[PDB]
Amino acid sequence: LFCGSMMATGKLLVSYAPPGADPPKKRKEAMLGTHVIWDIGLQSSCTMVVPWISNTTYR
Amino acid sequence: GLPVMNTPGSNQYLTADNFQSPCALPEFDVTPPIDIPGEVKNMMELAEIDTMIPFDLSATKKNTMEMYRVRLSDKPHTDDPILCLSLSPASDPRLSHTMLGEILNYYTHWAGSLKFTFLFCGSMMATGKLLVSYAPPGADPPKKRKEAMLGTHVIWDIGLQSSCTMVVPWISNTTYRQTIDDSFTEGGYISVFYQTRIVVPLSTPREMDILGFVSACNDFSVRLLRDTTHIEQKA
Amino acid sequence: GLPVMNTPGSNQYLTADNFQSPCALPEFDVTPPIDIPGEVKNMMELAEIDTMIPFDLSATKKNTMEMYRVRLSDKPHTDDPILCLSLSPASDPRLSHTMLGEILNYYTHWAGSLKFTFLFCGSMMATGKLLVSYAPPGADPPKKRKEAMLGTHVIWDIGLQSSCTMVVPWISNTTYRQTIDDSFTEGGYISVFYQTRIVVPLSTPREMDILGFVSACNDFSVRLLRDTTHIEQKA
Amino acid sequence: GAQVSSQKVGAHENSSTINYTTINYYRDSASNAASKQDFSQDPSKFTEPIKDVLIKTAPMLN
Amino acid sequence: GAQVSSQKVGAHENSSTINYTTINYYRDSASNAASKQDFSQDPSKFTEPIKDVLIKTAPMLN
Amino acid sequence: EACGYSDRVLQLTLGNSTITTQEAANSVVAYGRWPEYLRDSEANPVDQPTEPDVAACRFYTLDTVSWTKESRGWWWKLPDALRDMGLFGQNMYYHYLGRSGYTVHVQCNASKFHQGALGVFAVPEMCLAGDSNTTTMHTSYQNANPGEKGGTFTGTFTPDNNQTSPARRFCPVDYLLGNGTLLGNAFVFPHQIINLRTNNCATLVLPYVNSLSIDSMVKHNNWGIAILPLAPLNFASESSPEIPITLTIAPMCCEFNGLRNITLPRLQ
Amino acid sequence: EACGYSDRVLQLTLGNSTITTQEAANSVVAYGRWPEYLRDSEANPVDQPTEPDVAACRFYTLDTVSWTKESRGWWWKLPDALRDMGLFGQ
Amino acid sequence: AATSRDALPNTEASGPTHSKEIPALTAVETGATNPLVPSDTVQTRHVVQHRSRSESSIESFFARGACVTIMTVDNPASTTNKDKLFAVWKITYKDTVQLRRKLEFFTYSRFDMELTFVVTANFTETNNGHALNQVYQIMYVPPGAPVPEKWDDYTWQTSSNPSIFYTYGTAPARISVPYVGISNAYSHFYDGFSKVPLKDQSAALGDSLYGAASLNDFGILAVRVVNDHNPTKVTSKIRVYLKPKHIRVWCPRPPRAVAYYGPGVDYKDGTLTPLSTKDLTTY
Amino acid sequence: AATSRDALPNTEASGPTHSKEIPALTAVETGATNPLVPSDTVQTRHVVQHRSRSESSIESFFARGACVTIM
Ligand SMILES: CCCCCCCCCCCCC/C=C/[C@@H](O)[C@@H](N)CO
């Protein structure tokens, strides 16, 4: 949820990277996995779904 | 042998002629066509596409990204012209080099209705009302809103809808006009003015640019194919 | 006389033209045809027949019965090439003079799938496993089994069935390739290697020759008939 | 094998459709003359390449 | 006596099979032009001249 | 939709990536043709093709560039720009031939008090002009292909004078579309305009365009992405304002032929 | 086959690669189970899977080792052994 | 169904308007062009339209023979020390500007080619001797075939190559050629190279020209005077007229705005200022 | 019935193989040439063939005026 002023615009990148590799420290790497490019406007909030992606039936 | 008699034109080479002729590569396995996107069937199709107008062809702005930008301002109301332009699609320096003007220069005659669309590239906080005019030939070319208002025009109100289109109707004495500057086949005058005035709040730019585009209406056509002056080979 | 008008091309002689003409020997009793064996209807038929490749065109072997023999040996396994060859059917010295290459040089363009068959002329007591490879253009021409193994290939196992055929599939960007050396229409690389190693018992020759043959698949064709460079008349 | 067609008649004499006869002498299409019997198409793919079809009477942006 | 045939059409104009008309003026076949209407045949007599027909999926030598 | 739906608000989803936008001016589909796989009737290379699907047909975000009063414009080439992007670049280099469409999403937001117009153009076979007046068509492979970072346009043509050791690179002049033709006419080409007062971005869906059914992705670039300032950036009163232009692109219905060892280009 | 066919002579073809053998002792299919894709009824990870097909499902030839009177034996692990093999390792 | 020569749409009678419908208002940002017509922004009368786009069709636009090159050959006196001059021209539409600019209004093209040859000869020396009627041999040498090195060497036999034996003073020679491209369509522009520079391999080796495909697209035209050396020298010129028939074009482009500089899109200093001075507010 | 200018045979879609059938293997000694096609040794896609052998026919190959002497 974006609690900033109405006059304030912006575009954020929400990312999800399944295990096994170097934990993302830069947009470049994060962009390569499951993600959502959130555009700030009338619709105050943005939802990113972290899909059930695992080797074992349960964690 | 069948009795025949040769007539004038015999053995001559008409660059524009349309006959059959022996194939230098008989039985040649021709490579089939693939459904390539963007196929064109008629030059007029290109003339119907909006192309940006180089309005400000002034000594310093011409031949630079700037000639395309018609500058406006939050300044006080004035009945004076923002920009004056002659309806000579193929000959007038500001229209002659646009996709439309360029195709027109491959032809001797032009006919039909044109349409001029103006795009307001100023800030969202900036309001205003402009007057786009078209005055058919025969009289004193409009130099003041008063005169321009008296002919074919459109009062453009700036808002959500970024752009405004003014249609210059096919109004002429001759069935076709000449692709060159000619008193007899003259098209008239296209001028733009401040209906009220560009108004902006504080913390906002008092000056903005408006882009202009020209394209041909579905009633538009050209004839008498010819070689253009827009390109040459001195040597 | 019927009014006629002569057009461009009149009275000209097009070596490739196809018209009728007066017979110098009217009513001449022509000798009928007899059902002679071995009749051909299309040059491509000859291209589909296996013809021996002059692989070893080295300074001393070239232009001698030896250029046809690719020598192998019971020596230890090595990832190094037995023989490297470019997919230029008409231009590459080793292919240009084979029945296929020769017919290709009478044409400007070639297309379709080729097939390379290798014959093991060593002794019955001699076993072995070779790797025949084909690498489509655009990358570093294979110099080691490792790289060659990564592209189109066939692991040939030597036994009762004397020979092994590797099909070089029609894999190209253009609908047709040029019958000359050309970066743009390049075919790629054909290389051969030791999968394991030629093994032989005692009292047996540790060295043997393998013959290689090239021919065109039924999807193969040529176009744009032309004069070849493989023969001349200086004087 | 004669191909008979109609001439779009311009300036008519003080003299019903008029026709012209055409016959192909060669076996290769390339040898043939230009029919000029060509088709027009709607500029859409260039003047309105937008995903969501546009209605001129309504607001382009909504 | 006119002989009408079909042209295998390559590059088509923005303009249904197209035909070409042919007529023989001379009494002697030799005087005639080349039809180019020729036939293909299977290479078999040269690529597989062997007595016992061969099946590619099976061992050539058995 | 009386239900809510609108031209300005879109949601694009490819593979594991999703893009949202509340301020769009609709979307453009080049020549009215939506990207598609190579048909049997039009196919050339006989071998079973490699279709990466979701692994490559997803959204890659290139390095974000900065838009200022001084900027003359930016340019990119496809597939060149995506050559180093995850599984798509890997499959492109491992194969002799390859074909692909693209969903180009140019992002650039600001404020109701900012001014400016970005002319975003998709140009087929975007051949650019070189920096030399003594020689021609001389621009080196390394310089003609900037990769992800792309190149930029110049307000002025300044000829490479070092005859001995030539820069061997492009001199794309803005008002001439970097190629000998007037910018004002670039609009005959598939495009969209990013007018700060009207919209955050530009979405162009590009089909595989070319004289051939499939070609060499490494030797040849099918599409050229040109971004020029039709109307200069401007804010409140600040003499030197600035706003980012982020470019996100996704390969589509893409497929590859002629598999072999990986191609290691001399990119420097 | 009276036609010629035999247990010792086989031809295996995967993607752009083909293997031939004139001296084989037939072939073995582990636990009588032929390799297969992950079924919906047995699937776990919800995201659209990546199936390289011919690009990875082909024949990779590893470094050739030497067998001698002294050799005690060799070992490999999958997928480890193919980790650096073209599009499959990628 | 709509024919290139069908009459354009009739203008319909339109009256006054006071509605919520806004045709005049729009948003060029979307990439689209407002499909407006006179009746949308003004009161129009009913007009039966007779005008046609017949002459502006792709075929009609190019349906004209255009000069692509001027070949120079000759026939000297046996004695002269200098060689009998025979012409060799690499076939193309770029040696001249007019036709090239027209074809270039588009990215890709497809068409049967009609080549017409206009041959003119003349005397070079203030001599007075004469010369018998000349017979020219225009030989087409496709990429790969033995290119002639002498006005009279073995290659002129043309056993396989197509040759046109033109007789001076007779109706200009003419032949037709199919769509011969190794691609599904001619490429007016190639944004790439014929070679891939491989690291692992020497710089100079992987190098090639920008925008240039087949080093030898369509071979060459080799012209000579068949007649033997004549005491009095006669120089001849062969003008080649190229006409694109049964033509198709794809992906439109903005016309060449500045002086051509070589076979590519390259422009040259001092030629980049096409447009002339004209004030914003001056008719 | 097959015309010199008829389109060559279409390439048929071919999948993987683990069989007793050995197309790749043969014996040139017999005097014959292996009738193989891409789909026999590799995995192929379906391709509609438009190419022709029209220009390579006996008549087409010689259908050109050639210089045999200069008198
Ligand atoms: C006896 C006369 C024979 C004449 C032989 C002419 C055959 C060669 C014609 C080639 C046609 C080239 C037309 C222009 C193609 C260029 O645009 C290419 N760079 C584009 O692909």
Curated annotation (Swiss-Prot), chain A:
Q: Which domain of life is it from?
A: Viruses
Q: What does this protein do?
A: Forms an icosahedral capsid of pseudo T=3 symmetry with capsid proteins VP2 and VP1. The capsid is 300 Angstroms in diameter, composed of 60 copies of each capsid protein and enclosing the viral positive strand RNA genome.
Could you identify this protein by its name?
A: Capsid protein VP3
Which residues of the parent chain are present? Answer: 460 to 518 of 2209
> Where in the cell is the protein located?
Virion; Host cytoplasm
Subunit description: Interacts with capsid protein VP0 and capsid protein VP1 to form heterotrimeric protomers. Five protomers subsequently associate to form pentamers which serve as building blocks for the capsid. Interacts with capsid protein VP4 in the mature capsid. Interacts with protein 2C; this interaction may be important for virion morphogenesis.
- Organism per entry: Poliovirus type 1 (strain Mahoney)
Swiss-Prot record, chains B, C:
Q: Where in the cell is it found?
A: Virion; Host cytoplasm
Spell out where the chain crosses the membrane. none
Disulfide bond positions: none
Q: How does it assemble?
A: Interacts with capsid protein VP0 and capsid protein VP1 to form heterotrimeric protomers. Five protomers subsequently associate to form pentamers which serve as building blocks for the capsid. Interacts with capsid protein VP4 in the mature capsid. Interacts with protein 2C; this interaction may be important for virion morphogenesis.
Q: What does this protein do?
A: Forms an icosahedral capsid of pseudo T=3 symmetry with capsid proteins VP2 and VP1. The capsid is 300 Angstroms in diameter, composed of 60 copies of each capsid protein and enclosing the viral positive strand RNA genome.
Protein name, as recorded: Capsid protein VP3
Q: Which organism is this protein's natural source?
A: Poliovirus type 1 (strain Mahoney)
Mapped onto the parent protein, the portion here is 342 to 576 of 2209
Swiss-Prot record, chain F:
Residues passing through the membrane, by range: none
Q: Where in the cell is it found?
A: Virion; Host cytoplasm
Q: How does it assemble?
A: Interacts with capsid protein VP1 and capsid protein VP3 in the mature capsid.
This chain's function reads: Forms an icosahedral capsid of pseudo T=3 symmetry with capsid proteins VP1 and VP3. The capsid is 300 Angstroms in diameter, composed of 60 copies of each capsid protein and enclosing the viral positive strand RNA genome.
Q: What is this protein identified as?
A: Capsid protein VP2
Q: Which organism is it from?
A: Poliovirus type 1 (strain Mahoney)
Q: Recall the taxonomic lineage recorded for the source organism.
A: Viruses, Riboviria, Orthornavirae, Pisuviricota, Pisoniviricetes
